[PDB]
């Protein structure tokens, strides 16, 4: 193939497989940055000639994980406050404005906040 394995996409096309070592991450096939080197090209190198690719570090791609979270919906307020759900062990407190009819993600965490009144259109 090498078509998805070498170009970054917002969402993949086929279901990722944990055993496929050529995937960028065990839970995602294509890379998630335009300048991120594909993992297929990275391991096609002389230094991997006598290695065991299954034991090299393969952390789970964080882009796929963060979009598996539900959208927080705020009730009768257009401003959400996020702090990383840890206070002094999270990110700095940032206020998110939800006037626009979309889910605005937090700058640090990546959690997506919206209004309850906008949920029906958003969930379409």
């Amino acid at each position: 193939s090498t078509k998805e394995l070498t170009t970054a996409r917002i969402k993949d096309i086929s279901k990722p497989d944990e055993n496929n070592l050529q995937q960028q991450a065990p839970n995602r096939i294509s890379p998630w940055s335009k300048s991120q080197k594909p993992r297929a090209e990275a391991q096609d190198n002389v230094r991997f000639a006598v290695k065991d690719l299954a034991k090299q570090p393969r952390p789970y791609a964080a882009i796929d994980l963060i979009y598996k979270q539900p959208i927080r919906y705020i009730e009768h307020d257009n401003v959400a406050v996020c702090d990383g759900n840890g206070g002094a062990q999270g990110h700095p407190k940032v206020y998110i404005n939800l006037d626009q009819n979309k889910a605005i993600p937090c700058g640090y965490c990546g959690l997506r906040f919206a209004q309850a009144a906008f949920k029906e259109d958003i969930e379409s």
Binding site: V79, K93, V94, Y95, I96, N97, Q100, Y108
Partner: protein, 696 residues
């Protein structure tokens, strides 16, 4: 006029009517400011520049309060430092805690002034929270995070006054005042991206540069901008091998701390479509070849077709440096050929301005003097595209005085008001002898501006003859203290090519069906004849139509990868500076010509830059004075104006169509810049669309 005053014991002598802050800045006292910029109208709303005047209880906005005589101005009283910390404690009340994720991080004035002039602690633990605003989308070039705006109106004042784009303003009242465009529409100005530099905070940041570097990483290199002929002084920031961003730098004679949106956001074309290895055409495809094999093939190919005396054609592109021009001009004459010209679209074989007299093809009035001009006549020029920054200079004059601008050519949507006259030569003919021509002669320093696109018309010689006929018969247009005739160029290597006479004046030679064509960065040869039985070599840094036609391709270096000489439209000689290395095995542009000569039996005398830089003294002795203009002496200029006047010229009545039909695709780097592709989709070829279809 000057009023003598003391600021904190330092005597100050400034022009009368100046503000206190300019007086203080001259005495060396530093007065913190957010809303005051030295090229914008004065608003006094940020309230950070407050000082104390001896005969008053009320603190003075030193950016607005005009200077007095004998006045005593205090800046370091404990009363003032209390005020500075109070104001600082107010701006940061609603400011987001965004510094880690904010692209203004290491270069934000709200950080450095708060650190220097504010308190070290914050007293805002309120439970309701801060104010939040929605980010407005105003195009693909400006990334807005309006949470961070400190309501200083530099964006509004610049776009309204300098840029002439009245769609940006303050909508709302009080705590809900929201800088923006009210409705959703993209900002349409060729100078709109200069707002990114003015916005002191992270509210308006570059979209192409977003999240890519921190200001302490970059290495700043002072060079020139070659996307248009003004040669605006820029600053190129490189993080290692890549060029990350381009910014303006102060030069009050050329650009005045602005650069057009083409200049700054075309930096990402340098990483795409680059020529990195020599390529040799085999069959219908290219293969990689070494410099030994590629230089030999050109040497071998030249002797196979055996071009005669003047059957060798050299074509010079828009971006080409001056050192390569002379290296190529010497090389072709070393083979005894003078079929050397450019890839433009000129009609008459001797270009209407010619190359004999410098006064006929430069901007003789100098850009710094356009401020004091009384009347300006535009002939077939669209400065909004050809020289974007120069257009803003004319507007600033037309807003502060009674300058009247006259335009002859194709009508265009201009920033300042025009007095349209017509769209052909005959229209200009009556206008010169009519009411408008009378206006110029009565004026002290009138201006006549001829565009670069005049030549590319069928009536190239008629207009130059017509206008010169007016100039050759006046005393106000050309004085000892004024030279009122100007030509506006748009390709960055015209004045360089004409100063060294890289132009053929023999009509029969220009018609010779040349067999060996050596393309030096020429990428617009669609109309130019290239016979199927011609051996073409292209030496450039980008793969485009010029490289597609070639049979051997020799990679070269961009202006950010070499030291070179450029002469801008007004005759000023400017030398770039090397910021990075050329990619791959790509060599220097004039070094290839020297190395190619040794294979072709025309070994050039030069061995290095300094040896070649001695050659620039030979061709024209003014090409060794950097950033210095050698104005044409008044007497000799009047000789050149006469030879342009020729009885027996027929005006064909061709519309003086502007040559720039796409503002963003003009050079090789622009056509390969991914960001410029977004602009054409969002703004359009003429920056006229008001809605962004491309929005996702």
């Amino acid at each position: 006029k000057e009023v003598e005053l003391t600021v904190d014991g330092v005597k100050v002598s400034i022009e009368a009517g100046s503000s206190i802050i300019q007086a203080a800045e001259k005495a060396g006292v530093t007065i913190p400011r957010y809303c005051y910029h030295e090229k914008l109208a004065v608003a006094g709303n940020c309230r950070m520049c407050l000082v104390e005047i001896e005969r008053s209880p009320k603190l003075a906005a030193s950016c607005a309060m005009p200077v007095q005589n004998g006045m005593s101005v205090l800046t370091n009283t404990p009363k003032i430092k209390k005020a500075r910390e109070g104001v600082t404690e107010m701006l940061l009340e609603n400011h987001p805690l965004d510094c880690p994720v904010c692209d203004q991080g290491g270069e934000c004035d709200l950080q450095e002034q708060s650190l220097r002039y504010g308190s070290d602690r914050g007293r805002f633990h309120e439970i309701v929270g801060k104010r939040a605003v929605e980010n407005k989308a105003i195009g693909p070039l400006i990334k807005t995070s309006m949470n961070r705006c400190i309501h200083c109106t530099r964006c509004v004042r610049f776009l309204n006054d300098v840029a002439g784009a009245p769609e940006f303003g303050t909508a709302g009242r009080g705590n809900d005042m929201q800088i923006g465009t009210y409705v959703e529409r993209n900002v349409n100005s060729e100078l709109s991206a200069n707002v990114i530099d003015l916005c002191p905070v992270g509210a308006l940041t570059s979209k192409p540069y977003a999240f890519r570097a921190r200001p302490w990483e970059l290495k700043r290199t002072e060079t020139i901008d070659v996307h248009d002929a003004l040669g605006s002084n820029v600053r190129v920031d490189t993080r290692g091998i890549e060029v990350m961003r381009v910014l303006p730098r102060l030069n009050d004679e050329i650009n005045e701390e602005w650069i057009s949106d083409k200049t700054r956001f075309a930096c990402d074309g340098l990483k795409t479509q680059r020529l990195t290895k020599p390529l040799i055409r085999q069959g219908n495809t290219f293969v990689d070849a070494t410099w030994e094999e590629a230089l030999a093939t050109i040497a071998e190919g030249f002797q196979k077709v055996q071009p005669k005396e003047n059957e060798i054609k050299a074509i010079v592109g828009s971006l080409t440096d001056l050192e390569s021009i002379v290296a190529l001009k010497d090389l072709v004459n070393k083979l005894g050929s003078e079929n050397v010209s450019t890839d433009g679209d000129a009609t008459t074989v001797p270009p209407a301005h010619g190359a004999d007299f410098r006064s006929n093809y430069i901007f003789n009035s100098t850009i710094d003097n356009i401020e004091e001009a009384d009347q300006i006549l535009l002939v077939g020029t669209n400065p909004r595209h050809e020289a974007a920054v120069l257009n803003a200079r004319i507007r600033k004059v037309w807003l502060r005085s009674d300058l009247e601008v006259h335009h002859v050519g194709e009508e265009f949507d201009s920033t300042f008001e025009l007095n349209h006259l017509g769209s052909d030569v005959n229209a200009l003919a009556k206008a010169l002898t009519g009411e408008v021509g009378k206006k110029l002669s009565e004026a002290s320093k009138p201006l006549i501006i001829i565009g670069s696109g005049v030549t590319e018309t069928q009536d190239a010689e008629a207009v130059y003859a017509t206008v010169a006929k007016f100039v050759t018969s006046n005393a106000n247009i050309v004085t000892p203290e004024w030279n009122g005739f100007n030509l506006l160029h748009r390709e960055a290597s015209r004045v360089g090519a004409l100063d060294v006479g890289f132009t053929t004046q023999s009509p029969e030679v220009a018609n010779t069906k040349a067999k060996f064509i050596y393309l030096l960065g020429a990428d617009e040869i669609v109309n130019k004849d290239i016979p199927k039985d011609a051996f073409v070599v292209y030496q450039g840094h980008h793969g485009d139509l010029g490289a597609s036609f070639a049979d051997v391709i020799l990679p070269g270096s961009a202006y950010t990868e070499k030291t070179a000489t450029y002469v801008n439209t007004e005759g000023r000689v400017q030398s770039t500076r090397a910021a990075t290395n050329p990619p791959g095995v790509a060599r220097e542009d004039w070094m290839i010509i020297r190395a190619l000569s040794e294979y072709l039996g025309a070994t050039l005398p030069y061995d290095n830059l300094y040896e070649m830089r001695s050659r620039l003294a030979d061709v024209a002795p003014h090409l060794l004075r950097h950033e210095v203009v050698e104005p044409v002496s008044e007497g000799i200029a009047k000789v050149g104006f006469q030879s342009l006047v020729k009885p027996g010229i027929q005006s064909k009545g061709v519309l003086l169509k502007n040559p720039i039909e796409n503002f963003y695709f003009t050079d090789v780097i622009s056509k390969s810049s991914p960001t410029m592709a977004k602009c054409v989709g969002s703004f359009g070829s003429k920056i006229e669309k008001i809605k962004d279809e491309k929005a996702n």
